[PDB]
Each structure stands twice: as C-alpha cells, then as structure tokens.
Amino acid sequence: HPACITLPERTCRHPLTDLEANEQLGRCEDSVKNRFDRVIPFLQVVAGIPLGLDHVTRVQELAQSSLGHTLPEELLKDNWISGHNLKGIFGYATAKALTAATEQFSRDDSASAIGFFLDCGFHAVDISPCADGRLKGLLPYILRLPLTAFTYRKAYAGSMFDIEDDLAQWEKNELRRYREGVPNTADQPTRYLKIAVYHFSTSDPTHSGCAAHGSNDRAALEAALTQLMKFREAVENAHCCGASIDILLIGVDTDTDAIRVHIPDSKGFLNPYRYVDNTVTYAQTLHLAPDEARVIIHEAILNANRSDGWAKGNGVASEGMRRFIGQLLINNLSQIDYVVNRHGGRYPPNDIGHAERYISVGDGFDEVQIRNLAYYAHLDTVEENAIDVDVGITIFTKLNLSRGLPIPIAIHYRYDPNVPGSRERTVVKARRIYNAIKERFSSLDEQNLLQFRLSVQAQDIGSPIEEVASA
Amino acid sequence: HPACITLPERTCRHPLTDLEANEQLGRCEDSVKNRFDRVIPFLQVVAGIPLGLDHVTRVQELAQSSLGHTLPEELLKDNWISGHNLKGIFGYATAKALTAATEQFSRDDSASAIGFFLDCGFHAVDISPCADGRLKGLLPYILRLPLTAFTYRKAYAGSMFDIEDDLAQWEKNELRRYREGVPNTADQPTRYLKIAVYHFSTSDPTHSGCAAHGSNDRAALEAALTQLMKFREAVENAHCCGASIDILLIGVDTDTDAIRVHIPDSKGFLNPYRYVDNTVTYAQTLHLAPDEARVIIHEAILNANRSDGWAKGNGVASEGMRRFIGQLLINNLSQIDYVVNRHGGRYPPNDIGHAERYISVGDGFDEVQIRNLAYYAHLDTVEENAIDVDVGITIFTKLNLSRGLPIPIAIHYRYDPNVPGSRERTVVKARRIYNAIKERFSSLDEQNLLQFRLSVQAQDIGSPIEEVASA
Numbered sequence: 001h002p003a004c005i006t007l008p009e010r011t012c013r014h015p016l017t018d019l020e021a022n023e024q025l026g027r028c029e030d031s032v033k034n035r036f037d038r039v040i041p042f043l044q045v046v047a048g049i050p051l052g053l054d055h056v057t058r059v060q061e062l063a064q065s066s067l068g069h070t071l072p073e074e075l076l077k078d079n080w081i082s083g084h085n086l087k088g089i090f091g092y093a094t095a096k097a098l099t100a101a102t103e104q105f106s107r108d109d110s111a112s113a114i115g116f117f118l119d120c121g122f123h124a125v126d127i128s129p130c131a132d133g134r135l136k137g138l139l140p141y142i143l144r145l146p147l148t149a150f151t152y153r154k155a156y157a158g159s160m161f162d163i164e165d166d167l168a169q170w171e172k173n174e175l176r177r178y179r180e181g182v183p184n185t186a187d188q189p190t191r192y193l194k195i196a197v198y199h200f201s202t203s204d205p206t207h208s209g210c211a212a213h214g215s216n217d218r219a220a221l222e223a224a225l226t227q228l229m230k231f232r233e234a235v236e237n238a239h240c241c242g243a244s245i246d247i248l249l250i251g252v253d254t255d256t257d258a259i260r261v262h263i264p265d266s267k268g269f270l271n272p273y274r275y276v277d278n279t280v281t282y283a284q285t286l287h288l289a290p291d292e293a294r295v296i297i298h299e300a301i302l303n304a305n306r307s308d309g310w311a312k313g314n315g316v317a318s319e320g321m322r323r324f325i326g327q328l329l330i331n332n333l334s335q336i337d338y339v340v341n342r343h344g345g346r347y348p349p350n351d352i353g354h355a356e357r358y359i360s361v362g363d364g365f366d367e368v369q370i371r372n373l374a375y376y377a378h379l380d381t382v383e384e385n386a387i388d389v390d391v392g393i394t395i396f397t398k399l400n401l402s403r404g405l406p407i408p409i410a411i412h413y414r415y416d417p418n419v420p421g422s423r424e425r426t427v428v429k430a431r432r433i434y435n436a437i438k439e440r441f442s443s444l445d446e447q448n449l450l451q452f453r454l455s456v457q458a459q460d461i462g463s464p465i466e467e468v469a470s471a
Numbered sequence: 472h473p474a475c476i477t478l479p480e481r482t483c484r485h486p487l488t489d490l491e492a493n494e495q496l497g498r499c500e501d502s503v504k505n506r507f508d509r510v511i512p513f514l515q516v517v518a519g520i521p522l523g524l525d526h527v528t529r530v531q532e533l534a535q536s537s538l539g540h541t542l543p544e545e546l547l548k549d550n551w552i553s554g555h556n557l558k559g560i561f562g563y564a565t566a567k568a569l570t571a572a573t574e575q576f577s578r579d580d581s582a583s584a585i586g587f588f589l590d591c592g593f594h595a596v597d598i599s600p601c602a603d604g605r606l607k608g609l610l611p612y613i614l615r616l617p618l619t620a621f622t623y624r625k626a627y628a629g630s631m632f633d634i635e636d637d638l639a640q641w642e643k644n645e646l647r648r649y650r651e652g653v654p655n656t657a658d659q660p661t662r663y664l665k666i667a668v669y670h671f672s673t674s675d676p677t678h679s680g681c682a683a684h685g686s687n688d689r690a691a692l693e694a695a696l697t698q699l700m701k702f703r704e705a706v707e708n709a710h711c712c713g714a715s716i717d718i719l720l721i722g723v724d725t726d727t728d729a730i731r732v733h734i735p736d737s738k739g740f741l742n743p744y745r746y747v748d749n750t751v752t753y754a755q756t757l758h759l760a761p762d763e764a765r766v767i768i769h770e771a772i773l774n775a776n777r778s779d780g781w782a783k784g785n786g787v788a789s790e791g792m793r794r795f796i797g798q799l800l801i802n803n804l805s806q807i808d809y810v811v812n813r814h815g816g817r818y819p820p821n822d823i824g825h826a827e828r829y830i831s832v833g834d835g836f837d838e839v840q841i842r843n844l845a846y847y848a849h850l851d852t853v854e855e856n857a858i859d860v861d862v863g864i865t866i867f868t869k870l871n872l873s874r875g876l877p878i879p880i881a882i883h884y885r886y887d888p889n890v891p892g893s894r895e896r897t898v899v900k901a902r903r904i905y906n907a908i909k910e911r912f913s914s915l916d917e918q919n920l921l922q923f924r925l926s927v928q929a930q931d932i933g934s935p936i937e938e939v940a941s942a
C-alpha cells in the first residue's frame with residue numbers, strides 16, 4: 001500500500017484525521033448506496049412472481065418493506081406480452097432512492113469557508129474533474145471543501161472543461177465584485193481560481209485509468225493542464241488591463257483517493273513534474289504530532305518550489321496559494337484514512353473501476369457527492385456536450401444493459417426564484433435535454449432502456465429539490 | 472397608399488429623404504439579388520444540355536459568362552444515373568454569389584454613431600426583429616442605423632429573443648464599462664437599450680403578417696412587448712442596486728417599410744396604443760421645409776406622451792429617448808421614399824410575402840442586410856432554437872423545394888482573433904450546427920436538398936469572411 005506501509009498486518013491512523021467527519025461521511029456513503037442497490041434484489045423477487053394471478057397488494061407490500069415506499073398502480077399492470085413492468089418499476093424506485101437520499105442529506109460554515117478562500121487570495125473556486133463516477137466524491141470526501149455560493153464543480157469526460165462557459169462565469173463574478181462587492185470589492189488583490197482534476201489507478205494503470213485519454217496517465221494530465229492554460233489565455237486576451245486567474249492541477253489515484261497537487265511558481269505556471277504527493281506526505285507524517293505534521297507539509301510545498309531542472313519554476317507560489325494547497329493536502333489525509341479504515345487497503349476489486357448507479361446531467365447534486373454513485377456531466381445542451389453523454393452511456397451499457405437493466409438518468413438544473421421566468425426557462429431546458437437524449441439513443445429509448453428523472457432547485461444551497469414531469 | 476396620398480398619378484419626394492443614400496442602397500439591393508437570382512436561369516440552361524456527350528468546357532464557359540466564375544471539375548461529372556449535378560452546382564453557385572456580394576460591399580461613422588447613442592443615453596443598442604426575410608434590411612434600410620461594435624441585431628421567429636443570452640450580453644457590456652470605460656465609464660447615466668421589432672402587412676393582414684403569431688398583428692405586437700418586459704425583469708432582479716435597461720418597441724408594415732414606434736413614458740414603460748406612425752408623419756410633413764418637418768416630428772412624439780385613457784403613461788419619455796426616436800422616424804422617411812420611388816406604391820406582388828434566397832443561421836452578415844434576401848435566425852445551437860430553424864425550412868419548402876431546388880443555408884459565426892483558441896472553438900461550433908441541421912432534416916439531406924456554406928469572421932466590422940469546410 002503506497003501510504004500505509006504496515007498493511008495488511010497493521011492499520012494506520014493519521015494524527016491529522018478528522019474521525020467524526022470520516023464517520024459521518026461513511027454513514028452517508030453506505031446509506032445512500034444501499035437505497036439504490038437494494039432496488040436490484042427487489043426486482044429479482046418481482047420477476048419471480050407468477051403472471052396471470054393478481055399480485056398488486058403483494059408487490060406493494062414488498063415495495064413498502066424492502067424500499068420503504070409504495071408503487072403507483074399503473075406500474076403494476078403487467079403487459080400481456082412482456083409481463084411485469086420491471087423497467088418502469090426500476091426507473092421509479094431509482095428516482096425515489098434519489099429523492100430520499102437528497103432529502104435526508106439536504107443542508108455558519110458558509111461564511112467561514114469563503115473567508116478562507118479570500119484569505120488565500122481567491123474570490124471563486126471553480127473545479128473541473130473528469131465525469132468519471134469515482135471523482136463524484138471530490139468535494140466532500142477527497143478535498144473536504146465546503147459547499148459555498150462561490151465553489152463550483154463542473155465535470156467533463158477527460159476533464160475537458162467548457163472554456164467559453166468558464167469565461168462567462170468569470171465575467172459574471174467580476175461584475176458582481178464591481179457592482180455589489182460580493183464576495184469582496186474589485187480593488188482587492190484576489191483572483192478567480194480554476195482547478196482541473198485528472199485521475200489514474202496505481203493498481204491497474206493501463207485499464208482502470210481515464211478512458212477519455214485511453215488510460216494514458218500522461219495524456220490525461222497533459223490535457224487537463226492544457227485546458228487550464230487555454231482558459232487562462234482566454235481571460236487574459238479577451239479582457240484589457242491585466243485580467244488574470246490562478247490555476248491549479250490535482251491528480252487523483254482512484255484506488256486510494258490520495259491526491260498529488262501540482263505546485264504553481266511565483267508567476268502562476270504549473271509543471272507536470274513539480275508536485276507534492278500526498279501518499280508520501282501521509283507516510284512521512286504518520287508518526288508525528290499534529291503540529292509537526294503540518295510543518296512537514298508546509299515544507300514539502302516550499303521544497304517543490306526550490307526545484308531546478310525539469311521542475312524549474314520562476315520562484316515560489318504566493319503564500320495564499322501555498323496555504324490553500326496545504327489545507328487540501330491536510331484534508332485529504334483524512335480521506336486516505338477513510339479508505340484504509342473501511343477497506344483494509346485500497347478500494348475492493350468491485351469498487352476499483354466504474355460502479356456508478358445513475359448518470360447525472362446538468363448542474364449536479366450538492367447533496368450526494370459520493371465516489372462511484374453517479375457519472376456527472378455538466379452541460380446546458382446535449383448538442384454541445386454529446387461526447388460526455390456518449391461516454392456515460394458507454395459506461396452504463398457495461399454496468400446496466402449487459403444485465404437487462406435500464407440506464408437511469410437524472411436531469412437537474414438550478415434556477416433563481418427571484419428572477420421572474422427563471423424557473424420556467426430552466427424547466428424548458430430540462431425538457432430539451434430529455435428529448436435530445438431520447439432522440440440520440442432512440443433504440444435504447446424504444447426498448448424502455450432509458451429511465452429519466454427531471455428536477456429543478458433554487459440556487460441557494462439547501463433549497464428543496466423540485467421534480468418536474470418530462471412533459 | 473397610406474403615406475403617398477397622390478399615387479398612382481403623382482409620386483412623392485420627401486424633403487428629409489437622403490437621395491444619395493437611397494441610390495447606393497438601391498444599387499446594393501439590385502446587384503446583390505441579381506447575383507443570386509441569375510443562378511436559376513443558368514441551371515435551366517445546364518438542365519437542357521444533352522447527357523452522354525462531353526459538355527465540361529461548354530458548362531464552364533456558360534458559368535464564366537453568366538455567373539462570372541468557373542465551376543470545379545468534380546461538380547461537372549454527371550452521375551451515371553441521375554445526370555447533371557444540378558443540386559451541387561446550385562449550392563456552389565449560391566455560395567459564390569454570397570462570397571461575391573459580401574466581398575463587394577465589405578466596409579469615421581463608427582465613433583460618430585456611438586457618440587449619438589451615448590448622447591441619447593444608451594451605451595448599447597440591441598435589436599431583435601423577427602427572423603422573417605422582410606426585416607433583413609432593418610438596419611441599413613428601415614432604420615438607417617450604422618454598424619458599430621455596440622449595435623446588435625439578433626433575429627428570432629416571432630421576435631421571441633433569448634433572454635438569458637441577452638442577460639449575458641448585458642453583463643459583459645457592463646463589466647467592460649467598469650474595467651475599460653468603453654464605450655463610457657460605469658458612473659455615466661446611460662442604459663443598455665433593447666429594441667424588439669414586430670411586423671404586419673397592411674394590404675394582406677390575415678395572410679402576409681407574422682406567421683409565428685398566426686398573422687395576428689395584436690398577438691405579434693404583444694409577444695414582442697412581453698419579451699422586452701421579461702428581459703427588463705431579468706436584468707432588474709438578477710442584479711442588485713438599481714440594475715436597469717431601456718426598452719423600445721417598433722412595428723413595421725412590410726408592404727411599405729414604414730415604422731410605427733411605441734413611445735416610452737418617463738418610467739420607461741411602453742403601451743400598445745401609444746406610438747407615432749411614420750406613415751402619418753410622412754404625409755403631414757411632405758410639403759414642409761426640412762426644419763419645420765423636424766419640429767412636427769419632435770411635437771408628434773411629445774403629443775403621444777400627452778395621452779390619457781388607454782395610452783396613458785407616467786410622464787414623457789426622456790429627452791434622449793425622444794431624440795433617438797425622432798432620428799429613427801426621420802431616417803425611415805427616406806425608406807418610405809425608397810419603396811415609393813422604386814415601385815410606384817408598395818412592394819410589388821412578388822415581393823409582398825416571403826422571397827428569401829437563403830437561410831442564414833448564427834451571427835448573421837453585416838454586409839448583406841437587405842429585405843427578402845435571407846431568413847436569419849440567431850442561435851448558438853439548433854437544440855435551443857429548433858423552432859427558428861423549422862420555420863426557415865417551412866418557408867423554403869414553399870419557395871425552393873416546391874420547384875425542385877435545394878435549400879441553401881449559410882452558417883456564419885464571429886470569433887476573436889486576439890483570443891488563442893477562439894477561432895477553433897467557433898469552427899467546431901459551425902460544424903455542430905451543420906451536423907445538427909443535417910440530422911434534424913435527414914431525408915432532405917439524403918436527397919441533397921440542403922446545400923450548406925460555413926464561414927467564420929473576426930469580430931471587427933470589415934474583417935474578411937473565411938469559408939470553412941463542413942469537415
């Protein structure tokens with residue numbers, strides 16, 4: 001094991017691990033995944049019920065006791081040709097599992113978390129990981145970054161984030177600084193921070209890596225880094241008077257959830273060979289007092305910046321950037337422990353690759369950001385992001401269709417309840433996505449192999465999720 | 472005739488008509504339309520040439536003498552079964568007519584024009600007419616508004632413009648005022664102006680009106696007015712601290728190109744029954760001296776604000792708004808004369824309804840904004856604007872397909888040459904539109920009945936148009 005040397009015969013507990021958070025995060029992961037996974041054994045039972053004799057009450061009762069809810073009668077009308085509506089019941093029960101999980105974990109830290117970004121020199125934190133379900137837990141698990149109005153997470157196949165869209169967000173955010181002074185006034189020396197996250201598997205590099213880059217780790221890193229550079233060039237060249245941003249590249253080993261963070265130089269440039277590997281930091285501080293362990297991490301970040309040769313930079317990163325990076329590394333130590341303590345090593349064989357329960361498209365769920373729960377593609381149209389959609393369907397062809405299960409798809413968007421007509425335009429959008437995915441995969445749709453749930457939610461964190469009909 | 476009382480026995484010449492402009496606009500209209508229309512008689516000749524006997528040089532010589540260009544040899548290989556490549560030749564020659572017309576009319580007034588907007592209290596002028604080809608000449612003909620960096624024209628079926636897109640433009644413009652002070656500094660009391668344009672036919676109201684609104688003039692007006700109000704509500708409620716815009720509604724009689732302008736009140740609200748009709752203004756000032764004619768117009772606008780009852784407003788429009796409106800009315804007088812002088816009354820029967828030569832989608836052409844030349848739909852995706860594309864195809868089914876002619880479609884976008892990667896993102900977009908229209912009308916495409924041309928052009932006015940291959 002690359003972080004916990006003594007495994008399997010002795011388990012590591014890191015002195016910087018937040019134990020209560022790891023408990024809460026574990027309860028959340030098991031409970032949520034259970035809600036989805038228990039649908040499958042339930043369907044097997046339904047499938048064995050004899051056709052031809054009434055079994056409505058029998059099915060409704062089993063649903064109540066197995067899933068904790070009833071089913072609508074019209075899904076319990078067998079069709080004379082194909083029998084039980086297993087596809088329809090799967091889609092319904094899966095939508096209910098999502099409702100229950102988001103209601104249960106719906107959510108002070110708010111202002112303290114933005115205060116921390118501000119102090120590090122950032123007025124926004126915009127993060128783009130790969131769409132792969134094993135980065136779905138990126139914010140609450142891998143990085144332990146609290147949800148705030150200025151923390152974005154927009155996932156794309158291969159981390160290939162939308163440059164024009166990100167430019168538009170930069171513009172909106174900067175205008176708000178000028179007009180309202182939120183989260184700070186425009187005279188303050190802060191920058192918009194864009195983070196890209198690439199991933200790899202250390203136990204199965206050539207098969208379990210980023211498939212968008214052919215499981216070539218070098219190509220995945222370089223694509224993510226090139227996208228960051230291209231976004232910086234857009235902001236700098238599209239706007240006069242020294243417009244700029246900060247960039248950060250993070251790599252994730254999906255086997256252990258450990259990060260490696262690429263350290264910028266004093267000019268904000270990144271290098272593929274200049275980084276702190278948290279697996280080595282974990283091992284180097286495992287036997288230290290908490291305060292000493294923090295000093296080592298602070299020193300490891302600085303040491304990365306004194307590098308010459310291949311890793312040579314123009315000086316050290318700003319103090320705020322180095323503080324920010326130290327906190328990510330510190331948080332991530334808890335996550336390395338999380339996996340170690342739950343699995344006695346790396347994630348088990350059934351959780352090393354893709355094991356997503358649904359595809360999420362749109363703005364994503366704040367409430368259920370859990371590893372391998374969902375493949376998440378941020379998009380406003382299928383037309384502009386067709387590849388991200390095609391990659392999720394490919395993944396779900398192996399996961400679900402290979403075993404006769406439909407692909408469940410959650411379409412979800414945020415709106416502004418203070419803006420007249422915002423809710424309606426968002427609903428119209430949600431319904432365009434639905435029709436556009438149906439038209440793109442029309443034979444899958446004809447077989448009832450695509451099961452959709454549309455929803456909308458006010459932009460404030462903690463707002464109720466509002467389900468909307470497909471028409 | 473509603474403006475020139477003495478027709479047909481005597482023709483009016485208004486003392487405020489700009490004769491040199493009318494001549495140049497007429498030369499432009501006849502020359503451009505000729506380039507396109509002469510393709511058809513040419514194809515008839517090609518169609519009558521015997522198959523089986525070499526006629527390559529014969530076709531190349533006829534093309535040179537009729538069209539002023541040659542044809543590629545591969546278009547002149549008849550296919551063994553269906554003979555001459557008439558659909559391919561049509562598409563090619565039509566794309567060359569577009570190239571020739573935009574090169575010929577490619578373009579001091581610049582700064583003077585923005586100075587006039589500013590003086591009237593506007594830092595941007597953003598205009599959304601209906602996609603209908605008979606509004607295509609709106610800017611250089613109907614309103615005589617010069618092309619500037621802050622003059623937008625974005626056409627939609629029924630004038631139903633994109634509110635979110637317009638919000639984003641407002642944000643970008645406003646940021647530029649704060650950061651660069653272009654076209655003015657943010658402390659200046661100016662506003663973003665949004666204009667919506669509805670249209671109707673006085674000689675055939677129930678058939679030749681806006682089809683998006685069932686040729687119901689009241690519905691067309693009300694929809695355009697509601698969209699303006701909804702855009703105003705978006706800017707006001709999406710942003711703190713007194714964010715606001717100005718709005719203006721303009722009706723056009725497509726038979727004569729005369730406008731009716733709805734006068735705002737002192738709070739900026741519009742009323743369907745409070746307007747100055749330029750047809751009545753033309754008749755009332757026809758026999759006056761220029762200066763007296765201008766006083767009548769200034770007085771007509773003020774008199775509309777005197778209105779009680781149905782047309783009651785809270786006060787008079789701002790002095791800058793009234794000056795702006797007066798200039799539009801003054802300019803439009805020239806256009807009323809243009810039609811009268813060319814046609815001896817209203818447009819002739821063949822030019823009363825739809826007579827478009829191509830469909831334009833994307834950002835539109837600055838250089839060929841001529842009535843009934845093109846149906847124009849502003850869009851970044853087909854998905855989001857499917858109805859605008861469908862309406863153009865419906866129109867061209869009658870115009871072109873009914874006579875065995877393909878529908879020519881020009882896909883055109885602007886990019887920023889100072890932004891690294893902007894050109895390539897814009898080309899990728901152009902190619903998405905191409906494939907998305909092909910897939911939406913796949914049987915038309917199978918029959919070679921959709922002929923496309925893609926192009927891209929740096930954002931500065933006067934930049935060369937760069938054609939781009941469909942793949």
Ligand SMILES: [Zn+2]
Pocket residue numbers: 049055076077078083084085
């Ligand atoms: Zn059954």
Ligand SMILES: [Zn+2]
Pocket residue numbers: 130131132157158159199209210211212
């Ligand atoms: Zn990936």
Ligand SMILES: [Zn+2]
Pocket residue numbers: 520526547548549554555556
């Ligand atoms: Zn031939």
Ligand SMILES: [Zn+2]
Pocket residue numbers: 601602603628629630670680681682683
């Ligand atoms: Zn219309």
